[PDB]
Structure formats: structure tokens, C-alpha cells
Write an enzyme that holds these catalytic residues in place. Structure first.
Site, PDB file in Angstrom:
ATOM      1  N   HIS A 153       0.916  -1.287   0.254  1.00  0.00           N
ATOM      2  CA  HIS A 153       0.130   0.085   0.052  1.00  0.00           C
ATOM      3  C   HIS A 153       1.135   1.277   0.203  1.00  0.00           C
ATOM      4  O   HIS A 153       0.375   2.292  -0.330  1.00  0.00           O
ATOM      5  CB  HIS A 153      -1.095   0.147   0.966  1.00  0.00           C
ATOM      6  CG  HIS A 153      -2.797   0.843   1.291  1.00  0.00           C
ATOM      7  ND1 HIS A 153      -2.637   0.861   1.802  1.00  0.00           N
ATOM      8  CD2 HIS A 153      -2.231   2.364   0.022  1.00  0.00           C
ATOM      9  CE1 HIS A 153      -4.270   1.500   1.155  1.00  0.00           C
ATOM     10  NE2 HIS A 153      -3.477   2.672   0.262  1.00  0.00           N
ATOM     11  N   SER A 252     -27.878  11.218   2.885  1.00  0.00           N
ATOM     12  CA  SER A 252     -27.646  10.073   1.415  1.00  0.00           C
ATOM     13  C   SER A 252     -27.136   8.431   1.843  1.00  0.00           C
ATOM     14  O   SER A 252     -27.063   8.336   2.801  1.00  0.00           O
ATOM     15  CB  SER A 252     -25.953  11.112   1.140  1.00  0.00           C
ATOM     16  OG  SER A 252     -24.730   9.893   1.712  1.00  0.00           O
ATOM     17  N   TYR A 254     -24.983   6.784   0.875  1.00  0.00           N
ATOM     18  CA  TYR A 254     -24.048   6.128   1.564  1.00  0.00           C
ATOM     19  C   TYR A 254     -23.794   6.022   3.738  1.00  0.00           C
ATOM     20  O   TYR A 254     -23.762   5.177   4.313  1.00  0.00           O
ATOM     21  CB  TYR A 254     -22.898   6.914   1.436  1.00  0.00           C
ATOM     22  CG  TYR A 254     -21.381   5.991   2.074  1.00  0.00           C
ATOM     23  CD1 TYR A 254     -21.035   4.990   1.270  1.00  0.00           C
ATOM     24  CD2 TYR A 254     -21.149   6.369   3.380  1.00  0.00           C
ATOM     25  CE1 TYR A 254     -19.468   4.141   2.331  1.00  0.00           C
ATOM     26  CE2 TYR A 254     -19.879   6.070   3.664  1.00  0.00           C
ATOM     27  CZ  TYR A 254     -18.973   4.660   3.807  1.00  0.00           C
ATOM     28  OH  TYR A 254     -18.150   4.261   4.479  1.00  0.00           O
ATOM     29  N   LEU A 289      -9.202  17.981  -1.436  1.00  0.00           N
ATOM     30  CA  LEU A 289      -7.676  18.756  -1.530  1.00  0.00           C
ATOM     31  C   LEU A 289      -8.238  19.975  -2.597  1.00  0.00           C
ATOM     32  O   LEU A 289      -8.055  19.728  -3.899  1.00  0.00           O
ATOM     33  CB  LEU A 289      -6.930  18.249  -2.111  1.00  0.00           C
ATOM     34  CG  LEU A 289      -6.423  17.410  -1.342  1.00  0.00           C
ATOM     35  CD1 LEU A 289      -5.037  16.166  -1.373  1.00  0.00           C
ATOM     36  CD2 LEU A 289      -5.703  18.171   0.302  1.00  0.00           C
ATOM     37  N   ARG A 290      -8.332  21.504  -2.001  1.00  0.00           N
ATOM     38  CA  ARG A 290      -8.809  21.881  -2.767  1.00  0.00           C
ATOM     39  C   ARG A 290      -7.623  23.270  -3.944  1.00  0.00           C
ATOM     40  O   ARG A 290      -8.033  23.894  -5.116  1.00  0.00           O
ATOM     41  CB  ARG A 290      -9.073  23.440  -2.471  1.00  0.00           C
ATOM     42  CG  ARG A 290     -11.281  24.174  -3.418  1.00  0.00           C
ATOM     43  CD  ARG A 290     -11.611  22.842  -3.471  1.00  0.00           C
ATOM     44  NE  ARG A 290     -12.991  23.111  -3.639  1.00  0.00           N
ATOM     45  CZ  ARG A 290     -13.693  21.590  -4.003  1.00  0.00           C
ATOM     46  NH1 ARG A 290     -13.372  20.587  -4.666  1.00  0.00           N
ATOM     47  NH2 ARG A 290     -14.691  22.595  -4.038  1.00  0.00           N
ATOM     48  N   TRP A 371     -16.058   0.415  -1.849  1.00  0.00           N
ATOM     49  CA  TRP A 371     -15.920   0.667  -2.926  1.00  0.00           C
ATOM     50  C   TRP A 371     -16.886   0.811  -4.244  1.00  0.00           C
ATOM     51  O   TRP A 371     -15.955   0.653  -5.245  1.00  0.00           O
ATOM     52  CB  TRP A 371     -14.751  -1.058  -3.152  1.00  0.00           C
ATOM     53  CG  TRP A 371     -13.622  -1.497  -2.447  1.00  0.00           C
ATOM     54  CD1 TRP A 371     -13.298  -0.753  -1.676  1.00  0.00           C
ATOM     55  CD2 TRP A 371     -12.780  -2.545  -2.657  1.00  0.00           C
ATOM     56  NE1 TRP A 371     -12.175  -0.886  -1.263  1.00  0.00           N
ATOM     57  CE2 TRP A 371     -11.778  -2.417  -1.905  1.00  0.00           C
ATOM     58  CE3 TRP A 371     -13.433  -3.245  -3.343  1.00  0.00           C
ATOM     59  CZ2 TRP A 371     -11.163  -3.661  -1.640  1.00  0.00           C
ATOM     60  CZ3 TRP A 371     -12.200  -5.014  -3.655  1.00  0.00           C
ATOM     61  CH2 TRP A 371     -10.977  -4.348  -2.348  1.00  0.00           C
ATOM     62  N   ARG A 373     -17.562   2.724  -5.435  1.00  0.00           N
ATOM     63  CA  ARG A 373     -17.290   4.029  -6.377  1.00  0.00           C
ATOM     64  C   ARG A 373     -16.018   4.043  -7.531  1.00  0.00           C
ATOM     65  O   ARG A 373     -15.578   4.055  -8.935  1.00  0.00           O
ATOM     66  CB  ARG A 373     -17.290   5.254  -6.304  1.00  0.00           C
ATOM     67  CG  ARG A 373     -18.156   6.058  -5.617  1.00  0.00           C
ATOM     68  CD  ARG A 373     -18.267   7.536  -5.895  1.00  0.00           C
ATOM     69  NE  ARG A 373     -18.968   7.944  -4.470  1.00  0.00           N
ATOM     70  CZ  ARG A 373     -18.800   9.337  -4.654  1.00  0.00           C
ATOM     71  NH1 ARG A 373     -18.499  10.282  -5.327  1.00  0.00           N
ATOM     72  NH2 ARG A 373     -19.574   9.489  -2.983  1.00  0.00           N
ATOM     73  N   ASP A 380     -10.683  -6.529 -18.050  1.00  0.00           N
ATOM     74  CA  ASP A 380     -10.993  -6.739 -19.301  1.00  0.00           C
ATOM     75  C   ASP A 380      -9.931  -6.678 -19.669  1.00  0.00           C
ATOM     76  O   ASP A 380      -9.646  -6.095 -20.127  1.00  0.00           O
ATOM     77  CB  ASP A 380     -12.067  -6.194 -19.722  1.00  0.00           C
ATOM     78  CG  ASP A 380     -12.862  -7.386 -21.267  1.00  0.00           C
ATOM     79  OD1 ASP A 380     -11.584  -8.628 -21.557  1.00  0.00           O
ATOM     80  OD2 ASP A 380     -14.436  -7.236 -21.502  1.00  0.00           O
TER      81      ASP A 380
END
Ligand SMILES: CC(C)(COP(=O)(O)OP(=O)(O)OC[C@H]1O[C@@H](n2cnc3c(N)ncnc32)[C@H](O)[C@@H]1OP(=O)(O)O)[C@@H](O)C(=O)NCCC(=O)NCCSC(=O)/C=C/c1ccc(O)cc1
EC number: 2.3.1.133
Length: 431
Positions: A153, A252, A254, A289-290, A371, A373, A380
């Protein structure tokens, strides 16, 4: 479930890649110390061609040119900080056979004989020995195959990881790179000097049980992994609800789902009224993060929301209370909070100490990673998309994943590791 390795190969980038050291940010360091296991399952097309290792290995080698750090190794700098040694040493690619059929896995719960579909890494030997990425294609007697992924990771989060895997599968179909990897984690460099602006609950120690758990019930022994499917329809009813008990605020999907799981877990575990339970929610900061991160940013941008409740409140109040607690944290995590978090991490003397590994997730606490999204079904390789894609086995009790439907359809799946007695009760879930 017996695995017969047929062939093993250290695949290197197809051409010369840059020789360099890749700096890790604070959130590339505060990550789990292991190879994240994921597994894809594929039905056979019936073609003799199915998952030709040469096709796979040539594609792998191609993909390892733009994503070259994936072929490197861990090393420490002169300050003992872990960085990626981009030495193009390569990626392990294993082919195996098995007398088992895919359908033995039944519903595809991340039990960890599913860990056998991923090559195991012997951690040390050194930090610099084992490759960052391991891959196993396993041919089942039924004709189908599995792809097992083990990704260190430090190299990337699941977002960048999938970017590589999908790029690999693309190149196996003679397609080329789409969004190039952007390789520079210094965009997440902490401010100098570090000025935290918040108290970060996500980095404080998890609540322990007030009354110590029975070890003969709480080991890795007696920890069961299962899956459960919500339909949609149940997901429709779940989000609404919400209007339950006069409540007017709309949360929402989620939020309602994660609260429902969180709540369902607490009930299953019989948490007493005064017991605190902390929920760990992995949150992607690419969107928050903007100054705004490049597409194809290669690394870890996972931050953590951690709502907390006393069980007496969590389990007696309606589900929208759980969703409210969740929302209250998720909504605080704008760029300002995230930057504060990086600066907080910067001030800690040893980031390895902040790595969760349950202890963290053991009862009474819980992690929900979604996961939903992630483009987990886009791999494939030329023989079609996977029938299933999931975590390659859940190690800790108290860790759970939300998986999107392969068919789609609007159903979700929840994959969870709980103590075995608790697991039967966890069907407060369809409740
Ligand atoms: C969970 C989050 C925080 C939110 O999810 P959500 O609530 O379901 O979001 P929705 O899809 O319902 O709605 C999001 C939209 O809400 C919108 N929104 C914003 N504020 C509002 C508002 N105030 N009002 C109404 N709408 C609004 C906002 O625009 C946003 O749009 P967008 O972000 O563009 O989709 C999600 O954004 C997030 O951070 N997810 C983290 C990603 C994740 O789960 N990763 C799992 C990693 S597990 C791991 O270790 C991977 C290992 C791995 C390694 C290698 C591999 O190959 C595979 C795996």
C-alpha cells in the site's frame, strides 16, 4: 482447496524506466504495512485463448513503463523514512492450477482460503527484498480463472492501484494508456512550519471494551467472514426510513447504509449501553483537496472519518441518528481539515505508530470501506469483465467492505469479518 503453482516470473518494464527515489507523503506512510489483497473471478469464454500468460505478461510489462514505481522496491532515506526505490526490479507474476471450481467459492465471501489465490509475501528478508506488487492467475478445473492482486500500500491506494490494473487489462486488449500516471507525492507535503487547526479524532486511539473480551471467542479463531446482498429495494427503504420518527433532514445513501451497518454491528455484538463504538470510514481526498490533484495522481490520498457513539444512543435511537453522526464528520473534511491533518501527522515522531491494524477494528469498533465508486469491474483482459471482484480476504475482525453489483442493477454487497457468534446475529441487517 489445493493450489499447484505452474510457473513463476519476475516481469520487468518493457523498456528502460527512470531510475529514481520516490518520496512518500505522510498518508503514503500512515498506511497498512501489508499487501492489500484483492481478487477477480472470470468465467471462461470457451476459447483456448483464455488468459494466455504470454498475453498477460507482455501487457504487464507494457503497463509497467508508465507505472514504473509499481516495479520498484521499498528503501529508507538517510532519515529512516520509507521511500520507493524505482529500480525497475519488477513485479511477481505467478500462474497456478487447481482441481477446484470457481463455484466452490459459492457466494464469494472473502474467507481467506481466498488468500491462496494471491502469492504470499515473506516479509523480511528485508524491507527491500519483496516486490511491491504480486499477481496470480489461477486456472480452475471449470475453465474459469481468478486474478489475485497483492499490492504494497506504500505504492498506491485502491484508486491508483485500479488505475494500473485497468491500464494493464487495456493494454492486454491492444489498447493504450488513457490517463497517464502523474508521479509526485510532494503535492501532499505538509505545510512548513506545520500548523494543525483541528483536533483529529481519526488519529486518536480506538475505544477498548470496558469489560475485557473472552479470548476464546475473540481470536482469529472463531472470526468468520461473510457476504450479504441488499437488493436494491432494501436500499431504497433504508435511505427512507430517514423520515423515520419525524426526522426531516435528508441523509445520503452511503450515510444511511454505513450507519445501518454500524448500528447492525453494535446490536449483533450486544454492546452494553455505556460502551463506546468508533466507526472508521476511509475517505478519498482527491475530490476534497482544493488546490486540486492531477488526474492519474499516483499514490495514497486516503483520509479517515471516525464518528463515535455510546452504544446506548447508537442502538436505541433511529438509524438516521447513526447517519447523522457519520455526516457530521464527513462534512467537516474539506481541504482545510485535510491540510490540518497532514500537518498533524508531520508533528508525530513515528508514523508507523499511527497505523491501524485491529486492535483498531476489534470489537467494539468497526471499519467500513466502500468500493462502490471504484472501477473494480473494468479489468477486461480480453475475455470479458469479472463476475466478481472483492477484497482478497479480510484479516482483522471488525473490518468491512461495501461492493457494487457486477451486473448492475442497483444492489450492493457487504463483506464483513465478525466473531462467529456475533455473525449469526448480524441479521439485524435485513431488519
Ligand atoms: C465515502 C465517500 C466519502 C462519500 O461516498 P458517498 O456518500 O456514497 O458519496 P455519493 O456517491 O453518495 O455522492 C457524492 C457526491 O455528493 C456531492 N455532494 C457534496 N456535498 C454535497 C452536499 N452538501 N449536498 C448534496 N451533495 C453533495 C459531491 O459532489 C459528490 O460528487 P462526486 O464526489 O463528484 O461523486 C467517498 O467520496 C470516499 O471518500 N470514498 C473513499 C474511496 C473508497 O471507499 N476506497 C476504498 C479503498 S479500500 C483499500 O485499501 C484499497 C486497496 C486496494 C488496492 C489495490 C487494488 O487494486 C484494490 C484495492
Amino acid at each position: 482447496m489445493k493450489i499447484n503453482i505452474r510457473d513463476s516470473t519476475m516481469v520487468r518494464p518493457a523498456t528502460e524506466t527512470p531510475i529514481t527515489n520516490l518520496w512518500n507523503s505522510n498518508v503514503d506512510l500512515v498506511i497498512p504495512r501489508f499487501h492489500t489483497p484483492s481478487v477477480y473471478f472470470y468465467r471462461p469464454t470457451g476459447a483456448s485463448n483464455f488468459f494466455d500468460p504470454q498475453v498477460m505478461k507482455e501487457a504487464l510489462s507494457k503497463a509497467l513503463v508508465p507505472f514504473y514505481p509499481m516495479a520498484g522496491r521499498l528503501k529508507r532515506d538517510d532519515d529512516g523514512r520509507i521511500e520507493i526505490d524505482c529500480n525497475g526490479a519488477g513485479v511477481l507474476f505467478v500462474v497456478a492450477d487447481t482441481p477446484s471450481v470457481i463455484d466452490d467459492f459459492g457466494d464469494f465471501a472473502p474467507t481467506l482460503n481466498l488468500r491462496q489465490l494471491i502469492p504470499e509475501v515473506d516479509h523480511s528478508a528485508g524491507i527491500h527484498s519483496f516486490p511491491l506488487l504480486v499477481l496470480q492467475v489461477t486456472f480452475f478445473k471449470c475453465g474459469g480463472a481468478s486474478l489475485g492482486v497483492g499490492m504494497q500500500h506504500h505504492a498506491a491506494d485502491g484508486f491508483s492501484g485500479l488505475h494500473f490494473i485497468n491500464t494493464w487489462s487495456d493494454m492486454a486488449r491492444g489498447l493504450d494508456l488513457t490517463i497517464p500516471p502523474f508521479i509526485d507525492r510532494t503535492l501532499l507535503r505538509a505545510r512548513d512550519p506545520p500548523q494543525p487547526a483541528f483536533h483529529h479524532v481519526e488519529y486518536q486511539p480506538a475505544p477498548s471494551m470496558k469489560i475485557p473480551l473472552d479470548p476464546s471467542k475473540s481470536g482469529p479463531e472463531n472470526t468468520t467472514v461473510s457476504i450479504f446482498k441488499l437488493t436494491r429495494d432494501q436500499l431504497v427503504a433504508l435511505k427512507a426510513k430517514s423520515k423515520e420518527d419525524g426526522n426531516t433532514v435528508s441523509y445520503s445513501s452511503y450515510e444511511m447504509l454505513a450507519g445501518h451497518v454500524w448500528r447492525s454491528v453494535g446490536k449483533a455484538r450486544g454492546l452494553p449501553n455505556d460502551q463506546e463504538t468508533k466507526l472508521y470510514i476511509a475517505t478519498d481526498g482527491r475530490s476534497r483537496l482544493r488546490p486540486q490533484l492531477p488526474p492519474g495522481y499516483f499514490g495514497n490520498v486516503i483520509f479517515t472519518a471516525t464518528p463515535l457513539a455510546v452504544a446506548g444512543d447508537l442502538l436505541s435511537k433511529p438509524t438516521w441518528y447513526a447517519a447523522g453522526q457519520i455526516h457530521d464528520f464527513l462534512v467537516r473534511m474539506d481541504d482545510n481539515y485535510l491540510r490540518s491533518a497532514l500537518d498533524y501527522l508531520e508533528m508525530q515522531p513515528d508514523l508507523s505508530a499511527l497505523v491501524r491494524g485491529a486492535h483498531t477494528y476489534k470489537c467494539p469498533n468497526l471499519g467500513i470501506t466502500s468500493w462502490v465508486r471504484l472501477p473494480i469491474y473494468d479489468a477486461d483482459f480480453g475475455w470479458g469483465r469479472p463476475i466478481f471482484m472483492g477484497p482478497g480476504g479480510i484479516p482483522y475482525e471488525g473490518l468491512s467492505f461495501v461492493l457494487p453489483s457486477p451486473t448492475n442493477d442497483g444492489s450492493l454487497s457487504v463483506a464483513i469479518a465478525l466473531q462467529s457468534e456475533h455473525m449469526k446475529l448480524f441479521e439485524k441487517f435485513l431488519f
